[PDB]
Amino acid sequence: KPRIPVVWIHGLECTGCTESFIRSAHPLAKDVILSLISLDYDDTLMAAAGTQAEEVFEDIITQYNGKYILAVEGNPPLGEQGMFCISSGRPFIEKLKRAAAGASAIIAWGTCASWGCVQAARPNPTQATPIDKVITDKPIIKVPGCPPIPDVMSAIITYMVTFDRLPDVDRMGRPLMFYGQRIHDKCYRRAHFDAGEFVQSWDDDAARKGYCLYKMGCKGPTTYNACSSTRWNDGVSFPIQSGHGCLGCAENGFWDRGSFYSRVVDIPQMGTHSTADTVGLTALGVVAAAVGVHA
């Protein structure tokens, strides 16, 4: 049986998402490409270049019109008539619109395609714009993160192939399966958060015991992603586990949400042991000082 045609195009990006995709442990990217889909266009990996590459592009979107999946990495710039990103002598947005027109569905890989990511941060010199602001007449599945988790990417692919359907999405267009919950709601350091046990500076005793990174600016409480459960690189680690707080990289405009090392706000926080230690010493001092042994 023939494999579903996939067109993978690149706007302004860092290629982190393509890199993440090939890190997939199960299924291997090798097997995705050979057995599960038909990666018919992808600038990073395809043999053909220039006019040969253009011919492939045209042939696929024509032959399989209405039947291919469009995978989008990066985003189109609106500044300078789109010439901040040039493909075949023309603005990338033209290739984007052309590819979108014949696609049955669009996968927006990473924060770039979903939201804008780093190039869209202040002051957005190129007017980088997320795909869904440009394409409005097609189903778009946002798979945010910078990059998304390798095995999340492949799992979403295998879902759509095996179950022959788009994954259910929130109101933002994120797959519920991996983006339905917050990092903070599946973080193995929540015990410390809830106790009031925090790292206060790098490599302190709290850090060497793997205490919560909330005070170090962890944006876990406001970030939807699967890093605390699925984890990264065959479940080896994730940012918080290796001692850095979540940057919020799966969330819209996270680059402009204040310093990464600034506490997150409007998250309820009231420690169990930090509160009870305080109520204890307040009472004990009121007592010890009355007796006379303040020392």
Partner 1 sequence: FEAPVRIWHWLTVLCMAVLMVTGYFIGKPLPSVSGEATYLFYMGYIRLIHFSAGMVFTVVLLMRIYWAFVGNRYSRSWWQGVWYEIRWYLNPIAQAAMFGYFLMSVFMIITGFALYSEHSQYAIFAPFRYVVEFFYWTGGNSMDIHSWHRLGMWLIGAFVIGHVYMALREDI
Alpha helices in the chain (DSSP H): 16-21, 29-31, 50-63, 92-102, 110-114, 131-134, 150-162, 176-179, 190-195, 273-291
Q: Single out the residue of 49, 270, 293, 295 in contact with partner 1 (rule: CB under 8 A).
A: 270
Closest to 159 in 3D by CA, of 135, 138, 143: 143
If binding is defined by CB under 6 A, does position 68 make contact with ligand SF4? no
Residue 179, helix vs strand vs coil: helix
Q: Which is nearer to a copy of itself, 163 or 202 (CB)?
A: 163
- Which 3-state string (H, E, C) describes 206-225? CHHHCCECHHHCCCHHHCEC
Q: Tell me: is residue 85 an annotated ligand-binding position.
A: no
State the minimum distance, in angstroms, from the CB of residue 254 to ligand F3S: 8
Within a 10 A sphere around the Cβ of 154, how many other Cβ atoms? Answer: 23
Beta bridge partners of 75: 12
Q: Single out the residue of 70, 117, 227, 264 in contact with ligand F3S (rule: CB under 6 A).
A: 227
Closest to 141 in 3D by CA, of 174, 104, 102, 100: 174
Q: Which is nearer to a copy of itself, 165 or 208 (CB)?
A: 165
Q: What is the C-alpha to C-alpha distance for residues 69 and 66, in angstroms, rounded to an integer?
A: 9
Residue 50, helix vs strand vs coil: helix
**Residue 189 near residue 240, CB atoms below 8 Å:** yes
Q: Tell me: is residue 184 an annotated ligand-binding position.
A: yes
Q: Single out the residue of 96, 225, 252, 255 in contact with ligand F3S (rule: CB under 6 A).
A: 225
If binding is defined by CB under 6 A, does position 248 make contact with ligand SF4? no
Map residues 136-175 to x or -, x wherever contact with ligand F3S holds by CB under 6 A: ---------x------------------------------
State the minimum distance, in angstroms, from the CB of residue 223 to a copy of itself: 30
Q: Which is nearer to partner 1, 138 or 186 (CB)?
A: 186
If binding is defined by CB under 6 A, does position 6 make contact with ligand SF4? no
Map residues 183-222 to x or -, x wherever contact with ligand F3S holds by CB under 6 A: x---------------------------------------
**Residue 212 near residue 189, CB atoms below 8 Å:** yes
Q: Which is nearer to ligand F3S, 8 or 224 (CB)?
A: 224
Q: What is the C-alpha to C-alpha distance for residues 128 and 105, in angstroms, rounded to an integer?
A: 22
Listed as own residue / partner, the contacts of 52-55 with beta carbons closer than 8 Å and 24 or more positions apart are 54/88
Q: Which residues bind ligand SF4 (CB under 6 A)?
A: 183-184, 187, 189-190, 193, 212-214, 218, 220-221, 240, 245-246
Q: Which residues bind partner 1 (CB under 8 A)?
A: 181-182, 184-185, 194-195, 197, 209, 221-222, 267-268, 270-273, 275-276, 279-280, 283-284, 286-287, 290
